[PDB]
Amino acid sequence: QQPQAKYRHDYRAPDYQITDIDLTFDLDAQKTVVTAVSQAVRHGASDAPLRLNGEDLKLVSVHINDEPWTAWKEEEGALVISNLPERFTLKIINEISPAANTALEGLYQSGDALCTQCEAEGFRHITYYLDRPDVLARFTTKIIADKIKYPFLLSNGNRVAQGELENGRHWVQWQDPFPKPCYLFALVAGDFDVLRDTFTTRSGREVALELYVDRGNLDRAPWAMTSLKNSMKWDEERFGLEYDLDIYMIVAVDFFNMGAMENKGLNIFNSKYVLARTDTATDKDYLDIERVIGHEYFHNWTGNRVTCRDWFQLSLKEGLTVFRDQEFSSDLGSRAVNRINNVRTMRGLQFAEDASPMAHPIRPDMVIEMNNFYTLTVYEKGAEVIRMIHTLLGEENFQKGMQLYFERHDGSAATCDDFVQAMEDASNVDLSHFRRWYSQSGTPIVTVKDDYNPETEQYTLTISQRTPATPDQAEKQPLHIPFAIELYDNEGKVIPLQKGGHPVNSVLNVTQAEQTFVFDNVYFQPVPALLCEFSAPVKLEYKWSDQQLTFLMRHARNDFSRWDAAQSLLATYIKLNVARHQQGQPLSLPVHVADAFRAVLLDEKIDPALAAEILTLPSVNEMAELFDIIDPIAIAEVREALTRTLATELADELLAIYNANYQSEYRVEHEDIAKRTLRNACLRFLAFGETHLADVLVSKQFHEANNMTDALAALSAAVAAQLPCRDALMQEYDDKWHQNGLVMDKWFILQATSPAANVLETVRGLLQHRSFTMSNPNRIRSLIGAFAGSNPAAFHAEDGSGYLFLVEMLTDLNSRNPQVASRLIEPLIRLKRYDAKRQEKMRAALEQLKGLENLSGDLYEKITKALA
Numbered sequence: 001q002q003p004q005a006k007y008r009h010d011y012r013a014p015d016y017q018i019t020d021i022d023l024t025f026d027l028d029a030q031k032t033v034v035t036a037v038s039q040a041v042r043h044g045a046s047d048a049p050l051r052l053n054g055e056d057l058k059l060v061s062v063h064i065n066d067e068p069w070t071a072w073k074e075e076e077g078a079l080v081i082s083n084l085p086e087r088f089t090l091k092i093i094n095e096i097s098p099a100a101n102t103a104l105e106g107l108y109q110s111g112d113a114l115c116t117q118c119e120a121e122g123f124r125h126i127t128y129y130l131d132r133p134d135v136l137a138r139f140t141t142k143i144i145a146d147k148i149k150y151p152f153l154l155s156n157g158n159r160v161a162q163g164e165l166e167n168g169r170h171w172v173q174w175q176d177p178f179p180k181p182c183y184l185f186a187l188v189a190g191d192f193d194v195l196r197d198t199f200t201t202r203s204g205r206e207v208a209l210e211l212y213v214d215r216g217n218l219d220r221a222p223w224a225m226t227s228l229k230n231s232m233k234w235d236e237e238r239f240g241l242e243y244d245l246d247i248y249m250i251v252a253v254d255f256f257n258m259g260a261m262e263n264k265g266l267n268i269f270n271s272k273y274v275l276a277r278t279d280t281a282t283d284k285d286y287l288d289i290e291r292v293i294g295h296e297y298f299h300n301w302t303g304n305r306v307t308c309r310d311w312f313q314l315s316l317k318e319g320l321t322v323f324r325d326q327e328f329s330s331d332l333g334s335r336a337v338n339r340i341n342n343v344r345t346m347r348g349l350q351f352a353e354d355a356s357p358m359a360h361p362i363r364p365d366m367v368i369e370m371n372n373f374y375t376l377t378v379y380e381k382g383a384e385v386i387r388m389i390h391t392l393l394g395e396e397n398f399q400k401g402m403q404l405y406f407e408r409h410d411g412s413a414a415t416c417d418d419f420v421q422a423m424e425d426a427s428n429v430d431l432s433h434f435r436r437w438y439s440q441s442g443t444p445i446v447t448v449k450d451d452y453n454p455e456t457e458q459y460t461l462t463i464s465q466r467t468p469a470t471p472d473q474a475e476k477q478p479l480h481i482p483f484a485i486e487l488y489d490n491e492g493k494v495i496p497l498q499k500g501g502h503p504v505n506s507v508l509n510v511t512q513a514e515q516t517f518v519f520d521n522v523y524f525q526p527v528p529a530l531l532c533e534f535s536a537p538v539k540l541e542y543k544w545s546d547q548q549l550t551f552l553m554r555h556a557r558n559d560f561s562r563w564d565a566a567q568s569l570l571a572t573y574i575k576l577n578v579a580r581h582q583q584g585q586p587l588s589l590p591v592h593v594a595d596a597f598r599a600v601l602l603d604e605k606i607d608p609a610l611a612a613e614i615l616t617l618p619s620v621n622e623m624a625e626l627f628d629i630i631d632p633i634a635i636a637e638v639r640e641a642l643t644r645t646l647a648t649e650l651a652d653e654l655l656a657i658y659n660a661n662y663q664s665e666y667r668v669e670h671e672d673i674a675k676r677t678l679r680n681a682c683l684r685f686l687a688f689g690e691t692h693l694a695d696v697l698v699s700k701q702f703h704e705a706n707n708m709t710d711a712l713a714a715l716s717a718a719v720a721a722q723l724p725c726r727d728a729l730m731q732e733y734d735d736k737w738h739q740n741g742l743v744m745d746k747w748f749i750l751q752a753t754s755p756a757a758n759v760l761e762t763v764r765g766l767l768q769h770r771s772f773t774m775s776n777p778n779r780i781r782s783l784i785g786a787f788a789g790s791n792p793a794a795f796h797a798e799d800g801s802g803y804l805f806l807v808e809m810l811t812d813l814n815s816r817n818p819q820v821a822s823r824l825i826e827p828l829i830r831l832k833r834y835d836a837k838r839q840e841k842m843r844a845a846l847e848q849l850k851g852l853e854n855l856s857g858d859l860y861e862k863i864t865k866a867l868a
């Protein structure tokens, strides 16, 4: 009764195309009537039926060339229409109920507004259609609604007609000239404030920009508007791409399963990625709005003008658009901080997915529920694969490849292979072996051994690779790994790479299971920097000495290498101290490790942006990936103990740098953000100083803050260190902000990730909090999701209480909102990484969920893999 898996190798062109669709919506929250008039063309055999997808539709009528049709049947998920001519007009009338749509897939209610989400397969919840992304149709959309309740009626494209009717109704008709797959359809109806502006493209096209927000929120919209203009300008400058319509609409909605969605000319955003004011939004919020506005804008070419032939090609648009958003953020802001944080995500979150039961290549081969594959792998590893192409080609060749990709595939629904072929053909770089990155799951492990020969002045790297088997793939092969290096002499100067009288490129092509690279004219023993700028998404095994690593922290040319060396240095002592914790022994840390961080604090020449990240310890999820068996309690308690030890050893320096980076003016400007991130990195440690000093410092910052970045940093510190002021500050924040859900999400996260012994009792009680509701995905993610995913020490309490709590929540969400349920179940799918007693409790939890009445396909897919 659960759906069967679908396979990439079963792709077949559609038997029918639809070239044009004329939609009419007679809108109502309880009942919406949809009329869909489609112009269809048969491409397949004359006896093949038209198979339309549809979910939870009330069919009213079926006509073919205005003839009521008798040769049809409804089956599970489908309307099957037989005996059709080669070309015909299909007319479907059906009814749907937005108010009953709690899954937020299709047409649904967000507060008093009506809005849509159609990716991946939501349009079939609106009408019977060819809901597959290689069917590209020209849409015209006529929306009829009560004028008082729904004064703004929006769909893709341009307004081409409008009218008024009896009984207080009105209508607007929209025409989008670009053929599209239906996952890019959008409709919005509601009452909004509208921020209006203009962008003029470099060739002179004036684009009207319209940001729709709830009434009263115009003064929270200018940063998103500014970011949209910045995105448009950057895509012109960096990629040579201009917007292609004369109207760009963005609608902010409060109820949205995703971050945002690139519907053509009518993006729909979670309010979290639009609304910002300095008293309510942090620096991180500002830069996330920039990133997400950019991402959705960049999809206009990488996703919309060229779309996906089938959903197994998702990374064609998502890896490439993530790469574009990273490059945008990096160009405008701190490249090093962006790269560092994307590598933290890869190593600490995506690597874990790639070892888990849900492991998949960036181009999946097997899918049950496609909405389960909007993953760290498809997105973030997808972007690392694009970035490897960029590394192998260089910017100029890479842009030639982009240009050839659009020239060949503009206006079509293409494949990952098409994209690689365009890059290969434009650049003359052979990517045949490289293609295996699209087909193979799991994280490669690259092992490096080195040798310096003083007699010949040669340095030899012996490099091996392997990918462990994953649950989805028993066969693994070597990859084409771009392996960037730099060699340093004793004075920190770069040693030129050469062999036999010729320069050697610093990107080594590691293509074999084992190979040897020899460098000549190496006159002194080198300190290597390896896998520079995380040049391939791999685990590196090299036997660093502590002093090589502190040398790199002082001398490496690229800021990323200095941070990465610090990570390698910490990793050794995180592993040491988790083993000690398990034997009841306290933290042990050589003096020279603390001194390396002391030197970072006192180095006046280091970019504060970099110093702040070096002084930000790995998260508990990053730490977990260091271990064969995760002990989440040891990891959490070692992270705190490490923080305390550094706070004590560096107390004077931390306070000096905290004070030196004080800023009385607040500005959303990258140099100011960097100083603030350094100051607040110091605050985290100072919060673990002597209690009375810490309590005073933290509470003062909370009360004196003139911006939410500094207020939240102080509040977070009070929770993390369990300071005396904590309860008072948390109550003050609630009393001030309880009516603002986006702001309370920060507070729910702090509650959920608290180190307090009674955290689960508190989290359970917050299910009844005035600012919490199970009807809102953001609230769910901020309280329940943060508990299960970001507080593994409490989620994995040895009494099993965290698993039982999550089962309760998932029993609700399986029925209410399966997409949110499927995001929330992920911590349980990782059970084989834990000790036997925890595995037993997690299996029991998953078996309870497996037995639910009306188990969603979303959860079924993950439960089945986890219990295998």
Ligand SMILES: [NH3+][C@H]1CCc2cccc(-c3ccccc3)c2CC1(O)O
Binding pocket: 119, 258, 259, 260, 261, 262, 291, 292, 295, 296, 299, 318, 374, 375, 379
């Ligand atoms: N096509 C959509 C699908 C929904 C989805 C799912 C998971 C993540 C994201 C997302 C990634 C980076 C920045 C902002 C959002 C998105 C947005 C999207 O545009 O990719």
Ligand SMILES: [Cl-]
Binding pocket: 028, 029, 030, 031
């Ligand atoms: Cl109604």
Ligand SMILES: [Cl-]
Binding pocket: 212, 213, 214, 217, 252, 253, 254, 271
């Ligand atoms: Cl809003």
Ligand SMILES: [Cl-]
Binding pocket: 615, 616, 617, 684
């Ligand atoms: Cl930290």
Ligand SMILES: [Cl-]
Binding pocket: 797, 798, 799, 800
């Ligand atoms: Cl316990």
Ligand code: NA
Binding pocket: 065, 088, 089
């Ligand atoms: Na016709």
Ligand code: NA
Binding pocket: 329, 330, 331, 332, 333, 334, 335
């Ligand atoms: Na930059």
Ligand code: NA
Binding pocket: 121, 368, 369, 370, 857
């Ligand atoms: Na499905």
Ligand code: NA
Binding pocket: 369, 371, 857, 858
């Ligand atoms: Na579904």
Ligand code: NA
Binding pocket: 449, 450, 451
């Ligand atoms: Na050696």
Ligand code: NA
Binding pocket: 450, 543
């Ligand atoms: Na060595």
Ligand code: NA
Binding pocket: 505, 506, 507
């Ligand atoms: Na180079």
Ligand code: NA
Binding pocket: 509, 510, 511, 512, 515
């Ligand atoms: Na090679």
Ligand code: NA
Binding pocket: 767, 768, 769, 770, 771, 772, 773
């Ligand atoms: Na509530």
Ligand SMILES: [Zn+2]
Binding pocket: 295, 299, 317, 318, 321
């Ligand atoms: Zn995207």
